[PDB]
Amino acid sequence: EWYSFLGEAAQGAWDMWRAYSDMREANYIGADKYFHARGNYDAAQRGPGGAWAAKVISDARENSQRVTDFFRHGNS
Amino acid sequence: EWYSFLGEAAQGAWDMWRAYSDMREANYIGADKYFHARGNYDAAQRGPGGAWAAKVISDARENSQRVTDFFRHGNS
Amino acid sequence: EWYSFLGEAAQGAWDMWRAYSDMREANYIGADKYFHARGNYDAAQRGPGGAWAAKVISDARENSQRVTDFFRHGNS
Amino acid sequence: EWYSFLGEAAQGAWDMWRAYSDMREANYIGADKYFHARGNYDAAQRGPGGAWAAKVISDARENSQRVTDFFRHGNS
Amino acid sequence: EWYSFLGEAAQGAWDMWRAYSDMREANYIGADKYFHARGNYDAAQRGPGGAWAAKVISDARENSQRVTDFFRHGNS
Amino acid sequence: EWYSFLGEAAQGAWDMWRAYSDMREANYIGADKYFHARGNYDAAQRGPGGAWAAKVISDARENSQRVTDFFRHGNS
Amino acid sequence: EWYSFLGEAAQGAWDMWRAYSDMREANYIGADKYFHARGNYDAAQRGPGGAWAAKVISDARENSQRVTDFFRHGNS
Amino acid sequence: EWYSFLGEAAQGAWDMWRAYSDMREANYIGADKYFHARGNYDAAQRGPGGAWAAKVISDARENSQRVTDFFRHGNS
Amino acid sequence: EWYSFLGEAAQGAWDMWRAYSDMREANYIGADKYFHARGNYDAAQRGPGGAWAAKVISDARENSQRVTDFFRHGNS
Amino acid sequence: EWYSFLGEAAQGAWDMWRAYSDMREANYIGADKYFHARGNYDAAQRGPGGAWAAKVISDARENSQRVTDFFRHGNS
C-alpha cells in the first residue's frame, strides 16, 4: 500500500532539482537611469505614495494544512 | 495497491528537474531610461499612487489541503 | 492494482523536465525608453493610480484538495 | 503502508537540491543612477511616503498546520 | 507504518542542500549614484517618510503549529 | 443590477424556515433490547472493532469557497 | 449593485429560523436494555475496541474560505 | 454596493433564531440498563479499550479563513 | 460599500438568539443502572482503558484566521 | 466602508443572546446506580486506567489569529 494525495516523491537520482534562478534588476520603482534633465517636475508631485509594498522573492513555501478525524488500526 | 490523487512521482533518473529561469529587468514601474528631457511635467501629478503592490517571484508553493474522515484497517 | 486520478507519474529517464524559461523586460508599466521630450504633460495627470498590482512569476503551485470519507480494508 | 499528504520525500542521491539564486540590484525605490541634473524638482514633493514596505527575501518558510482528532491503534 | 503530512524527509546523500544565495546591492531606497547635480530640490520635500520599513533576509523560518486531541495506543 | 450565483435570498415573511427534526433512537450499534438469553456467544468474538466511527448530526454547515481575481470599478 | 455568491440573506420577518431538534437516545454503542441473561459471553471478547470515536452534535459550523487578489476602486 | 460571499445577514425581526435542542441520553457506551444477570462474562474481556473518544456537543464554531492580497482605494 | 466574507450580521430585533440546549444524562461510559447482579465478571477485564477521552461541551468557539497583505487607501 | 471577515456584529436589541444551557448528570464514568450486587468482580480488573481525561465545559473560547503585513493610509 503506497498512497499519496499531494506529493513530491522521488525514488532515484538527479530528480526534481533546480539550478539557476536569474532575476537581475527586476524591480525599479520610480527610478531613472542614464539621463540628462533640466528644470522638469517644477512644483510637481511624484510617487511612490499612499499604501504600497514591493517584494522580491526567489524561493518561498507558505503551505497550510487541515487534518481532522484520522483513524488507524493494525492487524487483527 | 498504488494510488495517487494529485501526485508528482518519479521512479527514475533526470526526471522533473528545472534548470534555467531567466527574467532580467522584468518589472519597471514609472521608470525612465536613456532620455533627454527639459521642463516636462510642469505642476503635474505622476504615479505610482493609491493602493498597489509589485511582486516578482521565481519559485513559490502555496498549497492548502483539507483531510477529513480517514479510516484505515489492516489484515483480518 | 494501479490507480491515478490527476497524476504526474514518470517511470523512466529524462521525462517531464523543463529547461529554459526566458522572459526579459516582460512588464513595463508607465515607463519610457530612448526618447527626447520637451514640455509635455503640462499640468497633466499620469498613472499608475487607483487599485492595481503587477506580478511576474516563473514557477508557482497553488493546488488545493478536499479529501473526505476514505475507507481502506486489507485481506480477509 | 506508506502515506503522504503534502510531502517532500527523496529516496536517492542528488535529489531536490537548489544551487544558484542570483538577484543583483533587484529593488531600487526612488533612486537615480548615472545622470546629470540641474534645477529640477523645484519646490516639488517626491516619494517614498505614506505607509509602505520593501522586502527582499531569498529563502523563507511560513507554513502553518492544524491537526485535530488523530487516533492510532496497534496490533490486536 | 510511515506517514508524513508536511515533511522534508531525505533518505540519501547530497539531497535538498542549497549552496549559493547572491543578492548584491538589492535594496537602495532614496539613494543616488554616480551623478553631478546643481541647485535641484530647492525648498523641496524628499522621502523616505511616514511609517515604513525595509528588510533584507536570506533564510528565515516562521512556522506555527496547532496540535489538538492526539491519542496513541500500543499493542493489545 | 441584482446578481446571485448560489444564494438563499428571502424578501418576505415565514420563508425558508424549518420546524421539526425528529430522530429518536436512530443509531444502535451492537446493542440488544428486550431479550432472554442463555449461554450464547461462548468463546466468541463480537464487534464493534477495527477502525470505525458513528456520528449523529442534526444541522451542520461545512461550506468552502475559493475567490480569486475580483476587480471592481465605480462610475467614470 | 447587490451581489452574493454563497449567501443567507433575509430581508423580512420570521425567516430562516429553526425551532425543534429532537434526538433522544440516538447513539447506543455496545449497550443492553431490559434483559435477563445467564452465563453468556463465557471467555468471550466484546467490543468496543481498536481505533474508534462516537460523536453526537446538534448545530455546528466548520466553514473555510480562501480570498485572494481582491481589488476595489471608487468613483473617478 | 452590497456584496457577500459566505454570509448570515438578517435585516429584520425574529430571523435565524434557534430555540430547542433536545438530546436526552444520547450516548451510552458499554452501559447496561434494567437487567438481571448471573455469572455472565466469566473470564471475558469487555470494551471500551484501545484509542477512542466520545464527544457530545450542542453548538460549536470552528471556522478558518485565509485572506491575502486585498487592495482598497477610495474616490479620485 | 458593505462587504462581508464570513459574517454574522444582524440589523434588527430578536435575531440569531438561542434559548434552550437540553442534554440530560448524555454520556454514560461503562456505567450500569437499575440492576441486580451476582457473580458476573469473574476474573474478567473491563474497560475503560488505554488512551481515551470523554468530553461534553455546550457552546464553544475555536476559530482561527490568517490575514496577510492588506492594503487600504483613502480619498485622493 | 464597513467590512467584516469573521464577525459577530449586532446593531439592535435582544440579538444573539443565549439563555439556557442544561446538562444534568452528563458524564458518568465507571459509576453504578441503584443496584444490589453480591460477589461480582472476583479478582477482576476494572477501569478507568491508562492515560485518559474527562472534561465538561459550558462556554469556552480558544481562538487564535495570525495578522501580517497590514498597511493603512489616510486621505491625500
Author numbering:
A (entry chain A), B (entry chain C), C (entry chain E), D (entry chain B), E (entry chain D), F (entry chain J), ...: 19 to 94
What sentences appear in the manuscript?
Specifically, AA amyloidosis represents a systemic disease characterized by the deposition of misfolded serum amyloid A protein (SAA) in multiple organs. This 12–14 kDa remarkably conserved apo-lipoprotein acts as molecular mop to remove membrane debris and lipid degradation products from inflammatory injury sites. As part of the host innate response to inflammation, acute-phase SAA is secreted by the liver to increase serum levels up to 1000-fold. Chronic inflammation leads to sustained increased SAA concentrations, to an extent that macrophages reportedly fail to prevent proteolysis-resistant oligomers during lysosomal degradation.
Herein, we present the cryo-EM structure of fibrils extracted post-mortem from the diseased kidney of a DSH cat with systemic AA amyloidosis, deceased in a shelter with extreme disease prevalence. About 65k from initially 380k segments were refined with C2 symmetry, a left-handed twist angle of 1.3° and a helical rise of 4.9 Å to yield a final map with a nominal resolution of 3.3 Å, as estimated from half-map Fourier shell correlation curves (FSC). The fibril structure is composed of two identical proto-filaments, and exhibits the cross-β architecture characteristic of amyloid. The polypeptide of each proto-filament comprises 11 β-strands between residue positions 19 and 94 and adopts an extended hairpin structure. A central β-arch between residues Asp-50 and Arg-64 links two ~25 residue long meandering tails that stick together via side chain contacts. A noteworthy feature following the β-arch is an unusual backbone bulge adopted by the P66GGAW70 segment comprising Pro-66 modeled as cis-isomer, in contrast to the trans-Proline residues in mouse and human AA amyloid. In the assembled fibril, the N-terminal tails are surface-exposed at the edges, while the C-terminal tails are buried facing each other. At the intra-protomer interface, the edge-tail of rung layer (i) contacts the face-tails (i-1) to (i + 2), creating four hydrophobic clusters, four ionic locks and additional H-bond interactions. On the other side, at the inter-protomer interface, the face-tail (i) contacts four rung layers of the adjacent proto-filament, creating two hydrophobic clusters, four ionic locks and two additional H-bond interactions. The higher dissociation cost is mainly caused by the eight-residue insert that increases fibril core mass and enlarges the buried surface area by ~2000 Å2.
